[PDB]
Design a protein around this ligand. Structure first.
Ligand SMILES: CCCC[C@@H](CN[C@@H](CCCC)C(=O)N[C@@H](CCC(N)=O)C(=O)N[C@@H](CCCNC(N)=[NH2+])C(N)=O)NC(=O)[C@@H](NC(=O)[C@@H](NC(C)=O)[C@@H](C)O)[C@@H](C)CC
Length: 99
C-alpha cells in the first residue's frame, strides 16, 4: 500500500497475540511498544529522543505482523507515549520513502 503523510501514519500491528495501533516512524531506529507481557527473555536498555531517555525492556525475535506483513525482530517495551514501528521492522516489510 501507499500511505500519504497528511495525518500521522498509524497502522494496526499484531504482537504477542495482541492487536495494537502504532506509528510508522522512519526517524526511529528501533520499535517501541507499550506495556504487555511476554517472554522470560528480556534485558534492560535506555532509548532516547526529544526530551531525553526512557528505560525499556528489550525482547528479541518477537513475531510482529504489520498491515498484514509478517516481521520478526527486536521489540522494546516501556512507557512510550505512542507505539512506534521503527526501521528495524520497516525494512523487513519493504517500506520505502518516495518523492
Ligand atoms: C529526535 C530523535 C529522532 C527522531 C525521533 C522521532 N520519533 C517521534 C515519536 C513519536 C512521539 C512519541 C517523535 O519524537 N515525534 C515528535 C517530533 C517533534 C514534533 N514536534 O514533530 C512529534 O511528532 N511530536 C508531536 C507529539 C507526538 C506526536 N506523535 C504521535 N502522537 N504519534 C508534537 N507535536 O509535539 N526518533 C526517536 O525518538 C527514536 N530515537 C532514535 O531513533 C534514536 N535516538 C536518538 C537520541 O536520536 C536512536 C539512537 O535510538 C526513539 C523512538 C527510539 C528508537
Amino acid at each position: 500500500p501507499q500511505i500519504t503523510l497528511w495525518k500521522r501514519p498509524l497502522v494496526t500491528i499484531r504482537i504477542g497475540g495482541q492487536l495494537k495501533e502504532a506509528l510508522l516512524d522512519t526517524g526511529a531506529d528501533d520499535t517501541v511498544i507499550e506495556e504487555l507481557n511476554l517472554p522470560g527473555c528480556w534485558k534492560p536498555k535506555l532509548i532516547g529522543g526529544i526530551x531525553g531517555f526512557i528505560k525499556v525492556r528489550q525482547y528479541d525475535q518477537i513475531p510482529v505482523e504489520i498491515a498484514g506483513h509478517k516481521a520478526i525482530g527486536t521489540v522494546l517495551v516501556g512507557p512510550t507515549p505512542v507505539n512506534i514501528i521503527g526501521r528495524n521492522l520497516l525494512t523487513q516489510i519493504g517500506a520505502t520513502l518516495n518523492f
